[PDB]
Design a protein around this ligand. Sequence first.
Ligand SMILES: C=CCN(Cc1ccccc1C(=O)NCc1ccccc1)Cc1ccc2c(c1C(=O)[O-])OCO2
Ligand SMILES: C=CCN(Cc1ccccc1C(=O)NCc1ccccc1)Cc1ccc2c(c1C(=O)[O-])OCO2
Lengths: 149, 149
Amino acid sequence: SPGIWQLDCTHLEGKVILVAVHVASGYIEAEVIPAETGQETAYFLLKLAGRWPVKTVHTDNGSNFTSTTVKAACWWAGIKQEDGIPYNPQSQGVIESMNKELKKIIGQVRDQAEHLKTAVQMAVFIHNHKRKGYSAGERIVDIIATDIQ
Amino acid sequence: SPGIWQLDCTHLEGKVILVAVHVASGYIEAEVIPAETGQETAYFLLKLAGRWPVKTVHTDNGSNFTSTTVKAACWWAGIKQEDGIPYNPQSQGVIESMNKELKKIIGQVRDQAEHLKTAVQMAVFIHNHKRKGYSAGERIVDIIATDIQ
Ligand SMILES: C=CCN(Cc1ccccc1C(=O)NCc1ccccc1)Cc1ccc2c(c1C(=O)[O-])OCO2
Ligand SMILES: C=CCN(Cc1ccccc1C(=O)NCc1ccccc1)Cc1ccc2c(c1C(=O)[O-])OCO2
């Protein structure tokens, strides 16, 4: 549970926003890329796993699941690459809700940056600090610290 | 001190590696950029602060300290922007040592990636996971969790 992340890909302004969600906390990391490729996805996971103890990744689609570059990054970083089949139906909904919330925040900050990537990082900030009470940033640290002890 | 980070800029292969060190743990995040500008430094800090509770940043040089874009990002993200003067002489040495260790790791992984940015993320991964016994990634989580509690 402390080590499980889910990949999520959403679109805006003709660009792609790749998101990793820490399932147990709702904490996120995201980046803007021109298109979702195996190489972009691989690099994103390598970044993520150098930063948090990533044990398992539920990939966002079958192409990233199949991708030999994505499998190579997961091998490199010690990550168990799994499919993203929502055996729990509530998962599709949580992710769609998350994409809608993130797009809302992006629109609230959109005029504060020329580039979409800036707005996306502002939205990540607001999302992770939003007190729900604890924030997602607080919850991820507590979950992992509890795990280490 | 759970919220204090130090910026560090180093060079390799005619490119710039921008590093943020979490002082109390030695945990790092880094990126490759073509040149250190205020815009690049501002964007990097915005990413960092959406991911960890960044309270204070010791800037790496006077230009980033002066930079109005860097000040604007620190304002946006709630970061107290400070100078980086090593009033403590041991700070120079610690950072110099980290740069040499990071470059060493980059050399050990260099052939496993075409692009320097890939090698740099591999190096961040090895650095944050190295047990010295706890790893820097373990120490940062514990420091911040204790703080939240
Ligand atoms: C001259 C700086 C460039 N602009 C100015 C701007 C243009 C249009 C609207 C507002 C602003 C503004 O000053 N917002 C406050 C602010 C500044 C920095 C960080 C957070 C908030 C911000 C910026 C900086 C670094 C970046 C960027 C961008 C970006 O515009 O996307 O993209 C990659 O790294
Ligand atoms: C087909 C992918 C391209 N290469 C292949 C390669 C070229 C030269 C030497 C080795 C390799 C190799 O397969 N290493 C294993 C490996 C693959 C992925 C992640 C970690 C380790 C890796 C790569 C992937 C994504 C990226 C990259 C790069 C990069 O080469 O820098 O840069 C930004 O996103």
